[PDB]
């Protein structure tokens, strides 16, 4: 339902939200359900559980939540979405994703990434368990990983949110360990390189057609340890974390 903005050619700071107390950690919004509702859940190893849901962008800032999610599992790394009312998450040293329905607060499902890597194999370049980084654009839900098969570089599949069933994959030449993250646009992967404590999206590889190309788009990286960078569809801004801050970046797009 979201029109694709192009081929992007810029990122810009645009907004802070707010130094969290986590490092790590991500936070979004969902586009299928458009609202002012953010959902927030900071990465502590091993004790990640919970998802915290703020009813507008004042509340987040004032750390007033309307509710928090117990979740039946805990949670390996940064990759989280919430898309069409249900969070998606990689469960704790597994390859699954788990499906879990936020208006009932029921499990909904369980899919497993056939060979994905998991639990600190192929995480991106900081670790912290964040091998399997779910993403959502125009062309849906999908997931970014890698797999030994791919010796450690970066797969991506689209994911069916209904059935939870695996409908395209495509094999990258991107090393995951080498990423700072990824996101996707139209169908495009987006690969950022960045310094921990050059930067920018050095790759991308698009799913229609198959070709990847080396690219050169600088990419902000103001507090030097990025943990999450999610796009969103219906804003076209990226969420980031960044070095606990919290934060939104701008995007301007040349013809695709
Ligand atoms: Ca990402």
């Known amino acids: 339902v979201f029109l694709c903005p192009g081929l992007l050619k810029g990122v810009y700071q645009s907004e802070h939200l707010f130094e969290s107390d986590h490092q790590s950690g991500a936070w979004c919004?969902?586009?299928?359900?458009?609202?002012?509702?953010?959902?927030?859940?900071?990465?502590?190893?091993?004790?990640?559980?919970?998802?915290?849901?703020?009813?507008?962008?004042?509340?987040?800032?004032?750390?007033?939540?309307?509710?928090?999610?117990?979740?039946?599992?805990?949670?390996?790394?940064?990759?989280?979405?919430?898309?069409?009312?249900?969070?998606?998450?990689?469960?704790?040293?597994?390859?699954?994703?788990?499906?879990?329905?936020?208006?009932?607060?029921?499990?909904?499902?369980?899919?497993?990434?056939?060979?994905?890597?998991?639990?600190?194999?192929?995480?991106?370049?900081?670790?912290?368990?964040?091998?399997?980084?779910?993403?959502?654009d125009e062309n849906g839900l999908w997931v970014i990983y890698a797999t030994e098969q791919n010796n450690?570089?970066?797969?991506?599949?689209?994911?069916?949110?209904?059935?939870?069933?695996?409908?395209?994959?495509?094999?990258?030449?991107?090393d995951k360990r080498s990423a700072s993250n990824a996101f996707m646009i139209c169908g495009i992967l987006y690969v950022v390189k960045s310094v921990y404590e050059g930067n920018?999206?050095?790759?991308?590889?698009?799913?229609?057609?198959?070709?990847?190309?080396?690219?050169?788009?600088?990419f902000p990286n103001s507090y030097q340890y990025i943990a999450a960078v999610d796009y969103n569809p219906r804003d076209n801004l990226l969420y980031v974390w960044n070095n606990y801050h919290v934060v939104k970046y701008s995007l301007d797009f040349g013809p695709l």
């Open 29 to 136: 919004k969902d586009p299928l359900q458009a609202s002012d509702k953010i959902y927030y859940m900071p990465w502590t190893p091993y004790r990640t559980d919970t998802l915290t849901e703020y009813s507008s962008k004042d509340d987040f800032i004032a750390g007033r939540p309307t509710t928090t999610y117990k979740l039946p599992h805990r949670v390996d790394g940064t990759g989280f979405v919430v898309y069409d009312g249900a969070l998606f998450f990689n469960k704790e040293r597994t390859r699954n994703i788990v499906k879990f329905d936020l208006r009932t607060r029921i499990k909904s499902g369980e899919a497993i990434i056939a060979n994905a890597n998991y639990h600190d194999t192929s995480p991106y370049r900081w670790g912290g368990k964040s091998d399997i980084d779910l993403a959502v």
């Open 152 to 174: 450690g570089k970066i797969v991506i599949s689209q994911l069916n949110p209904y059935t939870l069933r695996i409908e395209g994959t495509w094999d990258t030449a991107y």
């Open 200 to 218: 920018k999206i050095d790759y991308i590889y698009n799913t229609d057609q198959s070709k990847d190309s080396l690219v050169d788009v600088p």
